[PDB]
């Protein structure tokens with residue numbers, strides 16, 4: 001069902017695309033959200049995915065936090081994918097702009113290995129403040145399952161491919 005991707009490795013693929021539009025087209029089994037520990041989906045990929053669900057992702061996430069408390073940096077939880085996917089895997093990469101340890105990025109990507117195939121964004125990139133080239137390197141070196149990476153920014157996509 002995924003089309004137009006560049007193969008980087010045996011199991012990692014990449015495309016210049018909006019992950020929201022990709023999820024609406026493919027209806028993947030799992031879409032990854034670039035979450036924070038409170039599951040407050042205000043901006044970046046999380047704000048865009050939540051708006052595409054008409055805020056249903058945020059209402060579900062608030063009930064999850066009321067029952068379970070916050071996630072760990074490097075951790076994840078599986079919730080509904082609403083109108084975008086069967087499931088959403090909310091994964092917390094470290095936010096460098098909040099002073100979090102970049103070494104937790106490998107632990108964040110290890111959550112992907114629990115799912116045979118995923119549609120995902122680059123973790124800890126964008127407003128999370130990490131170097132996207134480093135994030136793609138950790139993804140390739142950690143994830144063993146089939147990951148389809150959707151990169152929204154065209155200039156970033158071109159830089160990630162040409163420096164890989």
Ligand SMILES: O=C(O)C1=C(c2ccc3ncsc3c2)CCC1
Nearest residue numbers: 019044045048125126151152153
């Ligand atoms: O350019 C990108 O691929 C990146 C992100 C992003 C942010 C917001 C957004 N809204 C719709 S698709 C999307 C992707 C976060 C990390 C890198």
